[PDB]
Amino acid sequence: GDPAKGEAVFKKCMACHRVGPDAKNLVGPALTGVIDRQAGTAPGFNYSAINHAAGEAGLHWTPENIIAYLPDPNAFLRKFLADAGHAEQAKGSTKMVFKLPDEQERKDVVAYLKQFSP
Ligand code: HEM
């Protein structure tokens, strides 16, 4: 992944997300420090039941998980919960109504996000 190109891909995320110092929540949660962060734990953000449940079931945003998540957020979260033994909690839908199908763009945007996490 190329972080330089990733910054350009992030333009597709900026309508709802912010990264950087004192980044604040908007329609979506701040993404500073999201790498390896438990899903649904960004301070002050009101998550969907499914995004919250996935984190409680063990979902952490490793680079691999973000890459697999971006092409279809709902599909990823529902499968994660089912595989974990919490299928009953995968009936809802995530508030993130956006998809990034292209593999390269996904790799690059994740490379960019890694710059803002330990
Ligand atoms: C390549 C594009 C984007 C990236 C990298 C991205 C990444 C993420 C990630 C990793 C999460 C989970 C964060 C957490 O659990 O703390 C998330 C949640 C969310 N994103 Fe995005 N996002 C992108 C674009 C968008 C856009 C454009 C929108 C909406 C038009 C959006 C709205 C949201 C919302 C509302 C949530 C919370 C979902 C929920 O609570 O169910 N995202 N995003």
Curated annotation (Swiss-Prot):
Q: Any keyword Repeat?
A: no
Any one Gene Ontology molecular-function term assigned to this protein's record? electron transfer activity
In terms of Gene3D superfamilies, this protein maps to: Cytochrome c-like domain
Which InterPro entries has this protein been placed in?
Cyt_c-like_dom, Cyt_c-like_dom_sf, Cyt_c_1A/1B
Signal peptide (residue range): none
PTM characteristics: Binds 1 heme c group covalently per subunit.
Gene Ontology biological process terms in this record: photosynthesis
Residues involved in heme c binding: C13, C16, H17, M96
In terms of Pfam families, this protein maps to: Cytochrom_C
Instruction: Check the record and name the PROSITE patterns matching this protein.
Output: CYTC
Keywords annotated in UniProt: Electron transport, Heme, Iron, Metal-binding, Photosynthesis, Transport
Q: What does this protein do?
A: Cytochrome c2 is found mainly in purple, non-sulfur, photosynthetic bacteria where it functions as the electron donor to the oxidized bacteriochlorophyll in the photophosphorylation pathway. However, it may also have a role in the respiratory chain and is found in some non-photosynthetic bacteria.
Q: Which family does it belong to?
A: Belongs to the cytochrome c family.
Q: What is this protein called?
A: Cytochrome c2 iso-2
